[PDB]
Amino acid sequence: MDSKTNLIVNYLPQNMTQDEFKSLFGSIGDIESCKLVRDKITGQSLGYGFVNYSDPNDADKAINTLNGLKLQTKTIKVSYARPSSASIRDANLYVSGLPKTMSQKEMEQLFSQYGRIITSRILLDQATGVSRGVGFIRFDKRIEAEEAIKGLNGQKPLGAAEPITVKFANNPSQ
RNA sequence: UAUUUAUUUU
Helix, strand or coil: CCCCCEEEEECCCCCCCHHHHHHHHHHHCCCCEEEEECCCCCCCCCEEEEECCCHHHHHHHHHHHHHEEECCCCCEEEEEECCCHHHHCCCCCECCCCCCCCCHHHHHHHHCCCEEEEEEEEEECCCCCCCEEEEEEECCCHHHHHHHHHHCCCCCCCCCCCCCEECCCCCCCC
């Protein structure tokens, strides 16, 4: 039984295509095959693919170089996409109302207790990006996050500003 | 005004 070769390359340049994606990695080693999370119902497209090598060595060795490829638009990163954690997919969460000294681990330990999170962090830059002050939690199970949110998110009435707000990604400027 | 914008796929 195999699966470990299921290397997932997340944050793919929407403007790029499957051929180039494969072509790009082509100059790395013996790429038995590749994959892409493409839908056949709505046809929206998320933005992450996969690389299936023959052996783990060239699979991990490649990671060393593809685990942080920054482009003019965005960054590309390959990871060991687990076979299946029983209904995983996008469990990304939005949590606003955090201070400048917001500790990622604190948020991680906070939401981790609610459910084993895949990736939890806060967006707040002042040199490379921009000043925001919001946190996010990428859980394994959406329902866990949804329920967590239900038992985590507060409220934002007129007689207030931001009394803790943790919810699912709504939309930035679209 | 919310993450590298979307780490889980004929």
